[PDB]
Amino acid sequence: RFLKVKNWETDVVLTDTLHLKSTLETGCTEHICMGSIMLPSVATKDQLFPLAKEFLDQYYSSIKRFGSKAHMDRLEEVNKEIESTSTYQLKDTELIYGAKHAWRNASRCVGRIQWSKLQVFDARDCTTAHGMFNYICNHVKYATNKGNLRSAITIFPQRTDGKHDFRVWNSQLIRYAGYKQPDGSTLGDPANVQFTEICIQQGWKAPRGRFDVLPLLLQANGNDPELFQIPPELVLEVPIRHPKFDWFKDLGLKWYGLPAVSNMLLEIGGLEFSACPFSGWYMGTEIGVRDYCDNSRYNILEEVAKKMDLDMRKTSSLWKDQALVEINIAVLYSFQSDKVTIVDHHSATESFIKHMENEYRCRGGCPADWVWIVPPMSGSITPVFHQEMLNYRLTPSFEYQPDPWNTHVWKG
Amino acid sequence: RFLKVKNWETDVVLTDTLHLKSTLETGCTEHICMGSIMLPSVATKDQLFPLAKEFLDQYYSSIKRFGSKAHMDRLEEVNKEIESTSTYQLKDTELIYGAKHAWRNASRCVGRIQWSKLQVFDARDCTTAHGMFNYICNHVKYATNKGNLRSAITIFPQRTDGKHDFRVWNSQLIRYAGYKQPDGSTLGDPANVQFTEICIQQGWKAPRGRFDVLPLLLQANGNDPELFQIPPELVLEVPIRHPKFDWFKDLGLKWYGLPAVSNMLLEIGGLEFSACPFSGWYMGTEIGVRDYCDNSRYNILEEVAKKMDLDMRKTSSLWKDQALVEINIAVLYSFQSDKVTIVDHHSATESFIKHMENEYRCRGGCPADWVWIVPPMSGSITPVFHQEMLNYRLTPSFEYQPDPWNTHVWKG
Ligand code: HEM
Ligand code: HEM
Ligand SMILES: Cc1cc(N)nc2cc(-c3ccc(CN)cc3O)c(F)cc12
Ligand SMILES: Cc1cc(N)nc2cc(-c3ccc(CN)cc3O)c(F)cc12
Ligand SMILES: C[C@H](O)[C@H](O)[C@H]1CNc2nc(N)[nH]c(=O)c2N1
Ligand SMILES: C[C@H](O)[C@H](O)[C@H]1CNc2nc(N)[nH]c(=O)c2N1
Ligand SMILES: [Zn+2]
Does CATH place domain B237-259+282-347 in 3.90.1230.10?
yes
Nearest neighbour of A28 by CB, restricted to B8, B30, B321:
B30
Ligand 1 lined by A373 (C-beta under 6 Å): no
DSSP state for residue B225 in the 8-state scheme = P
Q: CB of A390 within 8 A of CB of A3? A: yes
Element (H, E) at B249: helix B248-251
Residue B372 labelled as part of a binding site: yes
CB atoms under 10 Å from CB of A209, counted, come to: 11
Q: Which residues surround ligand 7, an ion (CB under 5 A)?
A: A 28, 33, 35; B 28, 33, 35
Q: Please judge whether B315 and A393 are an interchain contact, meaning their C-beta atoms are less than 8 angstroms apart.
A: no
The domain locations on chain B are: 16-124+151-161+265-279+349-373, 125-150+165-236+400-404, 237-259+282-347
| Single-letter amino acid code for the residue at B153 | I
Residues 6+ apart with CB under 8 A from B108: B369, B372, B373
Instruction: Please give the CATH superfamily to which domain A16-124+151-161+265-279+349-373 belongs.
Output: Nitric Oxide Synthase; Chain A, domain 1 (3.90.340.10)
C-alpha to C-alpha distance for B212 and B169, rounded to whole angstroms: 17
The Cα A180–Cα A190 span in angstroms is 8
Fold match flag (B125-150+165-236+400-404 vs B237-259+282-347)? no
Peptide bond into A396 cis (omega under 30): yes
C-alpha distances out from residue A38 to A23, A34, A110, A161, A286, Å: 20, 9, 17, 28, 17
Give the neighbor-by-neighbor strand order of the sheet with A119-122: A119-122, A152-155, A278-279, A260-261
Cα(A197)–Cα(A33) distance, rounded to whole angstroms?
37
Query: Could you give the 3-state DSSP secondary structure of residue A155?
Result: strand
Q: Which amino acid is at A278?
A: F
Distances (CA, A) of A172 to A98, A140, A186, B80, B290: 22, 11, 20, 67, 36
Angstrom distance (rounded) from CA A144 to CA A259: 10
Nearest to A321 by CA among A341, A305, A337: A305
Beta-strand relationship, B178-180 and B167-168: unpaired
Give the method of determination: X-ray
CB B385 near ligand 5, within 6 Å: yes
Q: How many helices (H) and strands (E) does chain A have?
A: 12, 18
Query: Measured in angstroms, how far is the CA atom of residue B261 from the centroid of ligand 4?
Result: 6
Report which of B320, B322, B308 is spatially closest to residue A322, judged by C-alpha positions: B322
What residues does A387 pair with on adjacent strands? A7
- What region does B235 belong to: left with phi over 0, alpha with psi -120 to 50, or beta? beta
* Resolution (Å units): 1.8
Q: Kindly state if the Cβ of B230 falls inside 6 Å of ligand 2.
A: no
Chain B CB contacts of A315 under 8 Å are: 344, 346-347
Which amino acid makes up residue B173? Answer: L
Question: Which residue's C-alpha comes closest to atom 18 of ligand 2?
Answer: B109
Helices (H), B1-144: 45-60, 69-85, 92-104, 129-144
| CB burial readout A149-167, b (16+ within 10 A) else e | bbbbbbbbbbbbeeeebbb
What's the rounded Cα separation, in Å, for the pair A227 and A22?
40
Question: CA A162, CA B326: separation in Å to the nearest integer?
Answer: 55
- A330: helix, strand or coil: helix
CA torsion B20→B26→B32→B35, rounded to 10°? -110
Residue nearest to atom 9 of ligand 4 (CA): B261
List the single best residue of B19, B26, B32, B244 to mutate versus A (max A Cβ within 10 A): B32
At a CB cut-off of 8 Å and minimum separation 6, what does B42 contact?
A: B159, B161, B162
Taking the C-alpha atoms of residue B26 and residue A43, their distance in angstroms, rounded to an integer, is 33
Distance (Å, whole) CA B261 – CA B258: 9
Q: CB-based burial of residue B174 (10 Å sphere; 0-12 exposed, 13-18 middle, 19+ buried)?
A: buried
Query: Alpha-carbon distance A396 to A98, whole Å?
Result: 6
Ligand 7 midpoint to CA B42 (Å)? 28
- Can you name the residues that pair with A48 across neighbouring β-strands? none
DSSP string covering B133-156: HHHHHHHHHHHHGGGS---EEEEP
* Beta pairing, strands B265-268 & B271-273: antiparallel
DSSP A41-84: ----HHHHHHHHHHHHHHHHTTTT-TTSHHHHHHHHHHHHHHHH
Determine the straight-line distance between the first and last CA of chain A, rounded to whole angstroms.
54
Cis previous bond, A231, omega within 30 = no
Q: Phi/psi zone of residue B269: left (φ > 0), alpha (ψ -120 to 50 degrees), beta?
A: left
Instruction: Tell me the fold of B125-150+165-236+400-404.
Output: Nitric Oxide Synthase;Heme Domain; Chain A, domain 2 (3.90.440)
Nearest Cβ partner for B376 among A324, A385, A389: A385
At B348, give phi and psi (nearest 5°). -70, -40
The whole-angstrom separation of Cα A168 and Cα A183 is 32
Chain A CB contacts of B387 below 8 Å: 36
Which residues of chain A are within 8 Å of residue B370 when distances are taken between CB atoms?
35-36, 371
**Residue B67: CB atoms within 10 Å:** 10
Q: How far is A284 from chain B (nearest CA, A)?
A: 9
